[PDB]
């Protein structure tokens, strides 16, 4: 059964991080919300507050998982890209050769933390610019953008199509279009 690892930092995309835990839950993959401070709960961009479900530094330790999901949010990215817990991840993640997606915002944090340079990716539009600040990557504007094991996604109305890309991905073409049908998209 496949395991993700969702980091949630305060001044992340609450949309963004909510679609892809609830589509990926749905899919049958256990989904670990890690609370980037802590255990405490954490405020997103628009004010709605998660309880995370551990502490990044708790599930750090629960071994690898399957796939490691960045959401967007300015700030929230930003706490990501300063973060030395998420250096370390997505280090593993990617010697260990795992999947790592990130979208709207979310991407330029695979930047600061130098995470898979030459891949094709896509950010927002607005974020853009941060992301290909010394040109480490090639821009795409696709909704969803997935070159290898770094998959990327634009935004908010742009989070169920990166979140069942994210499920095919892990699950296959049958199981993504289950889980799709229902969502009434």
């Known amino acids: 059964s496949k395991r993700a690892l969702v980091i949630l930092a305060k001044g992340a995309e609450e949309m963004e991080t909510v679609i892809p835990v609830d589509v990926m839950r749905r899919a049958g993959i256990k989904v670990t919300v890690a609370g980037l401070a802590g255990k405490d709960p954490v405020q997103c961009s628009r004010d709605v507050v998660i309880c995370p479900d551990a502490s990044l530094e708790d599930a750090k330790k629960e071994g690898p998982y399957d796939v490691v999901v960045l959401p967007g949010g300015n700030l929230g990215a930003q706490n990501l890209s300063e973060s030395a817990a998420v250096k370390e991840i997505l280090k593993e993640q990617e010697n260990r050769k795992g999947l ?86």
Do not use: W
């Not at 979310?106 to 130098?114: N, Q, S």
């Not at 279009?177 to 229902?182: D, G, R």
């Open 100 to 185: 790592i997606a990130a979208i709207c915002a979310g991407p330029t944090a695979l930047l600061a933390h130098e995470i898979g340079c030459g891949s094709k990716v896509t950010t927002h539009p607005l974020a853009k610019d941060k992301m290909m600040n010394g040109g480490h990557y090639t821009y795409s504007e696709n909704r969803v953008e997935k070159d290898g094991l770094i998959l990327t996604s634009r935004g908010p109305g742009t989070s169920f199509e990166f979140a069942l890309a994210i499920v095919e991905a892990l699950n296959g073409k049958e199981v993504a279009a289950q889980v799709k049908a229902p969502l009434v998209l």
